[PDB]
Amino acid sequence: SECVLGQSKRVDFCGKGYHLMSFPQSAPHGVVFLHVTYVPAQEKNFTTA
Amino acid sequence: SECVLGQSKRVDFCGKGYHLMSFPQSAPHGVVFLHVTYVPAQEKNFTTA
Numbered sequence: 455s456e457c458v459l460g461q462s463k464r465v466d467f468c469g470k471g472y473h474l475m476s477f478p479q480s481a482p483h484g485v486v487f488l489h490v491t492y493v494p495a496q497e498k499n500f501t502t503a
Numbered sequence: 504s505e506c507v508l509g510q511s512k513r514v515d516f517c518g519k520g521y522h523l524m525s526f527p528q529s530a531p532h533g534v535v536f537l538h539v540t541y542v543p544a545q546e547k548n549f550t551t552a
């Protein structure tokens with residue numbers, strides 16, 4: 455109800471990272487989710503003020 | 504603690520729709536809530552870019 459029908463702001467609830475979407479799948483006495491995420495890749499440090 | 508004392512961004516937690524407020528009511532061996540919501544009514548389709 456939280457991940458599939460909306461977007462979740464709870465950290466590390468609908469995937470590791472920043473949550474985007476989700477899809478449910480059926481299973482033999484279970485359910486399987488396919489969480490989508492968003493992970494920064496390349497870092498370049500600077501000087502701030 | 505979440506619905507009554509504030510506003511919830513969790514989907515389908517304090518009612519079905521966009522949650523606004525809540526009110527608690529007592530009952531024998533239980534509690535009863537009155538969730539207020541906000542639901543769109545009339546649609547109209549357009550063209551977007």
Ligand SMILES: *[C@@H]1O[C@H](CO)[C@@H](O)[C@H](O)[C@H]1NC(C)=O
Nearest residue numbers: 496497498499500501502503
């Ligand atoms: C960025 O970090 C590296 C080591 O982590 C350092 O050598 C470099 O000076 C840093 N960049 C700046 C602009 O100081």
Ligand SMILES: *[C@@H]1O[C@H](CO)[C@@H](O)[C@H](O)[C@H]1NC(C)=O
Nearest residue numbers: 545546547548549550551552
């Ligand atoms: C809006 O939807 C109706 C039926 O779904 C369709 O007939 C109509 O063409 C749509 N609006 C526009 C501007 O196409």
